[PDB]
Structure formats: C-alpha cells, structure tokens
RNA sequence: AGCUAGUUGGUAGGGUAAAUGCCUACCAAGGCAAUGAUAAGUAACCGGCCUGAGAGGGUGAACGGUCACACUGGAACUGA
RNA sequence: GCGUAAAGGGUGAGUAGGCGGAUAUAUAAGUCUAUGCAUAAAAUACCACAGCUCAACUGUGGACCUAUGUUGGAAACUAUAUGUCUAGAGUCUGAUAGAGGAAGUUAGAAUUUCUGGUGUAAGGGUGGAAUCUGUUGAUAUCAGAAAGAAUACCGGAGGCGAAGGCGAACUUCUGGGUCAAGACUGACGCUGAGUCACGAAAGCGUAGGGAGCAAACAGGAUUAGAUACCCUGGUAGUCUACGCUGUAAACGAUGCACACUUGGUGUUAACUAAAAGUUAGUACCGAAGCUAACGUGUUAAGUGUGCCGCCUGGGGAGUAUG
RNA sequence: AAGCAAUUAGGUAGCAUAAAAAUGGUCCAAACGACUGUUUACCAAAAACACAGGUCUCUGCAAAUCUGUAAAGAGAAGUAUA
RNA sequence: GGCGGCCGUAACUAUAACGGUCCUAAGGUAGCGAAAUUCCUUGUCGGGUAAGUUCCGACCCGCACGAAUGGUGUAACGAUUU
C-alpha cells in the first residue's frame, strides 16, 4: 500500500479540492489529521470539520472556506518533513512562513502546535507543513 | 528529430562492424 | 489441481476450526501443496515458462508469509516448519 | 576481488616502567572481505587560511599544538 | 532533471537495504528543552572599548554559532519492546471472460514434384526486353499419389499475458486476472543494489526435415560503370527435438506503487430480464492545470510522496586497455 | 633427550654427513605432426603410416564387395543408428 | 581438374582506389607470405652477437602460397628438425 503519508495524503486531497473549488472534502481520520485540521480551524483557513461514518469506517468531512469571489483561503499548502527527508528545528531556528502571513505547523513534545505557539512556549520539533 | 544524429550513429556502427569483420579470422 | 476436499481438509487440520481459512498456517500449507504439484508438473513440461513464473510467485509469497510468521509467533513458526518439512 | 600462514585464537615462557604475537616454543585453522578486505596512486595532521548570502567548495604559507626525520640503511650504551 | 534536447534498466520474481494503515502502554536511540552544567589551549574569525600622530598593526573584555560528554525533564513524530482494530493486502466460497502456457492427436484449401489421359507452339516476364521453360510434348485441362510449411472468412478505434508474445479444431496438464457483504487472518505492505528466471528476429552446436520463400552466388537486362534497385534460377537459413547466444525504433522513445483532481463519444467483461447505471479495463476528442513548443490532459507529461535505474557540451568513443 | 612415527633440541666428529653404487640437466623461441603407437629383419624411426573426428558416394538382403570357369564361401548366423 | 593479361589515371615524387580493352568454363575470396615453397638473394628494415649467408619479428616486387591433394592457429605431447 505504501501510503507513506497520513499527512501528505490529507494535504494533497485538501489542496486539490481547494483549488478546483469544491465545498467540502472528505478525508481519512487520525489523531494527527484531527490536530492539523483543528489548527487550520483556529487559524481561519477552514470553516469547520465533522466526524462521520461510512461502512463502519470513520471519516472527517471538512468545509472549505473561500472569499466571496471564490478565491480560496488556502493559497499554497505544502509539506516540509518527509519520510525520506526528516526536518527538525530548534525553537530559535524556526522559519517564519512568509513573514508571518502564513503559518508553520510542527509536531513537538507538547503536541502538534503552530509556529507562533512553539516560539511562545519555547519548544521545537519536527516541521510538518507550511500553509499560506 | 532531425535524423542527422541517427545517421551519424549509423555510419559509426557500420565502420566499427567493418573493422571487426576485417579482424575476424585473423590470429 | 488441489481439489476442494483436500483444500478443506488442510484447513481443518491446520486452522483452529473449520472456518479458519485465513490463518497463516493454512496459508502456508495450501501454498506448499500448490508448490509440490507444480514442481511435479514442471518436471515433466520443462519448456513451460508461464507455469514456472506462477511457481516462483508462489514461492515468494510463501517466503513473505514465513518471515511474518517467524517474526510474530516464533515457536509456532518452528513447529510449522518442522511439521511441513520446509528446511531452515 | 580475494587477502593473511605469527597470519587468527588458546596454554606456558622471553622481555618491558607497563598490557598485548611485542617475541619464542607447542595446541587448533582460524581471522578479514561487495556494509569494500587487500592492493595501487596521492598526502604530514589540526587549530586555521582563501572564497561564498549561507550551505558548501578549495586549501594546510606565516604563527601555535601534535607526529615523523636529520646523508642512506641498522644497532645498542649512558641516562628520570 | 530523464515523451521528442544528454537521461527510465527488455521484463518479472525476490536477498540485503530504504520506506510504510489506525490505536494503547513502556523504553528515551533520534528529536526538543533548562540556549542547565562542562569540555571544544592561545592566537585568528564577530561586537564594543583602548594604545602606536591614524590606519595597518597591537592589547583588554564581551559574545554568536555547532561539536562532544554529562545532569534533570517533555513525548507528538522516527526508532525499540509487548498488544488491540480492519479500511490495505491475502486465504476460503460463488460467479465469469480470455489467440495465457506446455504436451499429445486431427483437419481442409492452396502450391510444388511424380505418374497416367486430352491437346499444340508457345509459355513466362517487364516501363520496355532478355535470360529461363517448351516439339525428349511445355503452358492449359482431368484423375491419382506423396511431402513440407502456414492457418483466408471470423478478425476490429478486440481479448489475454510482466514483457517478448499469443488466431484452423479437440483433449489432457497448468499460470494469472475481474466482480461480491461473504466469511476468515489481522499490516502479513511498497520498491528493490547484487543474484536468479524469462526474453522477437538473426546466429551457433548435435540430429532430422526441406514444399514454398530466400542472404551468399550464377545468368539476363538498365547504365559510362551496376559487386544494386528489375527478371530467371539458386545454397545456408526459414521448420522439429535438445543444448547455447541474451541483442532490437525490446517504444507509449513516458520505471513501479498508492492517495486525489470537470466532461463528451464509442467499445470489452461482469452485475441487473433487458434498458439504465455502476465496477474493472480499452480507444478518440477535450475544460482547468502543466509544457520551450509540439502536445499532454482520470490509461497526466496535473497536484503529493516511497524506492530503484539513469544524465552533466560535441567529436574522439561505446573506441583503446583490463 | 623429546616424539607414535616423521621430525624437533642439545652435544660430538670430519674437507665432505641422499658421504659407496643405483637414481631427471634446466629454461626461452620457431617449423612439422594433435596425442599413446606403427614402419624400410641387415646404412633411412622421421615431418612418413595409423589414429579418434569429418565429408562424399555405393548397398533392400538369393545386398553392395571380394576369391573362383563354376558350385560355394566371406560379408553375416549381420540388416541403412548396418 | 582449372582459377588471365595489357594500357592510362590524384594540389611534388611515388605508386594506382579508378577507367578502358582482349580472351576464357571461370580468372585466386578469407587467410598466409624470401615460407619444409623466393631463381635473382647474404632482398629490405628491426631484434639478438664485439662481429650472425643460420634464427626471430615485419615489409610484399608471391620466378613458382592458398582453402578437405585442406587454409590459418593451437594447450598438451616428441630418443624429430632449428
């Protein structure tokens, strides 16, 4: 099967649905996927996400958010760390994505947290993805 | 493709094969 | 061919019960039976190459299952190889 | 692309300020190697120097530390 | 970066290796932190402040990295150890399509040769001729016998297989795929350096067979010449059994696998009585996107990653040498 | 003296210790024939002949072939893989 | 069993890839070549030697090599020749 990304699969599905301009997208469900979508939700990139059922398997249905002119909120969403190339960073060397206009998402000792929260709590970890 | 490059390769191959045929049976 | 009767017979022997087809021991035993009658067939029909490819795919499947079983349940693995004759 | 036969390890002994095949006498055939042994070529090493946004690349002048050598090849004495 | 510029291995099965669903607990190797604590001699390198008339130069302090060791913590992720689940992948059951492969039998058309009748001067061939065949009875026509090779029609914007490839008919042996609530195992997976297996045609060894076709070769023509194109002949080879060779424009010039991303028009198989739709393929056009352009476009060359192979100006050169 | 022996260590003696006799000279390159063999008894032992291997051709059995005027015999108490 | 001659021709000189012509059943391909074959000849050059008509490696102007009277090589073998 070599899924190789419970993370990149959802990222790619979300990216594709967002650019074609769908209303909702329907992802596999995991603790990290939930955490990431939660961070998106606070940051105002997605409207909401719900938990569901199909054939006894749980899904996450995410409500894509666009402006009134159908320009997506997500512009570019892309992975940094990667099974063949794992990228870790200290809390000082954390990149500020696009001069802060975007957000960085990392996995740290205290859970999956945004870059600003990682800086404010003085913790660092794996660089999951960058969204702007 | 223009095919001049393929022609170049062809004549090279012919010359090399001719060399080998000439030096066959020699010992 | 391995007829339905010996198929079910080996299932009954090797599984925990009558419905336990999918367990690893049943898997390996069935593939071993297939390998045996195929090596018999290919001993005769030496220029048969599609069959040889099928045999080799079966052998690879058996090795894969054997590694998984030996890693997970070791003593069952040694009992199984000793019973089936698969050398180590 | 195979190499090593004091070569690998063991038991005693020689010797050393001191461990060790460092050396010797016996007992085994072992040891290393496509996760690169062995071989050939090149080269003193480092703190550093030059370059470059950085990562890197090249490099080992002077100065400072270590190592090796003092015509070529050996050997022991004196002595902490 | 690898469709066409140099770059995807001919194809597959797999060892080492790399990577890999959901979830619980423990370990703390990786990672992160107290930029704890030390060690990273001095000078040099960075920032200030000073002394040589300044600068170079020189001196006193202050640090920024990141490198190792160690102390106490955090645990998401990778890793380690023990479990749990089923949606991935398999086994079992049922249904079903197919030139898939191997072995053993059989068939007819057509052609050639041989034998026996009828019958006479041409046949054959080209842009035009000739060589050749024929008065030893040709060609044509009728009947019989023998051998070899290949399978019209079905037959295609098909089908199957990993690829090469596979089409007269039957049996035996045998490989793979697809669909489903239809239960079982519970991540058992992806890719894969060496290695192994297969691999059109040509070629080689041994032993047969040899109708037709046909390198080499011979003759007749075209031409200044014709070691060719054309014509008449013709030996290997083409065929069978076994053992080697392992090369192709072996091409979709596009490696494999998974998760996604508007449609139009046909077509194959299955489910459904059939339409009608779905699923798994297989073709054409085409929106967005992509592309140097050509083009590609749910069978991506689109958006992502896993692993392998390969490229770094042309000639010399896939040569010399090992 | 050790050691089962082969050898090992020490000592002794000589110019010489497989002490006598018996008991390979070796290396490099070329020509011819592959090779072991055979041949001119009595001047030629070779590069000649033979050889396994190869090709052509003959022979359907009262076979080809050979010896004889013949019968007959060999081929063969064999059968084209002969 | 057989497997040819003559003549002319290139940015000197040399040769002749090429062309013409006569004749024949067809005019010697691969490979080899002063050879167990080469008369001229102790051809020419290189190696070996202080000095090499022999020997080895080549050149090709092969009097008069040549493909089962086999051609060119070849590990091993030889009371053979050098």
Radius of gyration of chain A: 15 Å
C-alpha end-to-end distance of chain C: 27 Å
**Structural class by sheet pairing and helices of chain A:** alpha+beta
Helical residues, percent of chain C:
over 70%
Classification by helices and strands of chain C: mainly alpha
Question: How many beta strands in the DSSP annotation of chain C?
Answer: 0
Q: Total number of helical segments of chain C?
A: 4
Please bin the fraction of helical residues of chain A.
Answer: 25-40%
The general outline of chain A is globular
Q: N-to-C terminal Cα separation of chain A, in Å?
A: 31 Å
Largest sheet of chain A: 5 strands, antiparallel
Helix/strand order of chain C: HHHH
The total count of helices of chain A amounts to: 3
SS strand fraction of chain C: under 5%
Order of helices and strands of chain A: HEHEEEEEEHE
Number of strands of chain A: 8
Report the major sheet of chain C: none
Structure write-up:
This is part of a larger assembly, with chains A (132 residues), B (27 residues) and C (88 residues). In chain A, 26% of the residues lie in helices and 30% in strands. Chain A is α+β, with helices and mostly antiparallel strands and 132 residues long. Chain A is globular. Chain B has 27 residues and is mostly helical. Chain B contains one helix and no strands. Chain C has 88 residues and is an all-alpha fold. Chain C is built from four helices and no strands. The radius of gyration of chain C is 14 Å and the shape is globular. The chains hardly touch. The structure holds four RNA strands. Chain A: It comes from Borreliella burgdorferi (strain ATCC 35210 / DSM 4680 / CIP 102532 / B31) (Borrelia burgdorferi).
Keywords:
part of a larger assembly, 3 chains, B: 27 residues, mainly alpha, 0% strand, C: 88 residues, 4 helices, RNA-binding, ribosome, hibernating ribosome, bacterial
Task: Set out the fold topology.
This is part of a larger assembly, with chains A (132 residues), B (27 residues) and C (88 residues).
Chain A: H1 6-20, E1 24-28, H2 31-43, E2 46-51, E3 59-64, E4 77-79, E5 88-89, E6 103-108, E7 111-114, H3 115-120, E8 125-131
Antiparallel strand pairs in A: 1-3, 2-3, 4-8, 5-8, 6-7, 6-8
Chain B: H1 4-23
Chain C: H1 4-14, H2 24-44, H3 50-72, H4 74-84
Helix pairs in contact in C: 1-2, 2-3, 3-4
The structure holds 4 RNA strands.
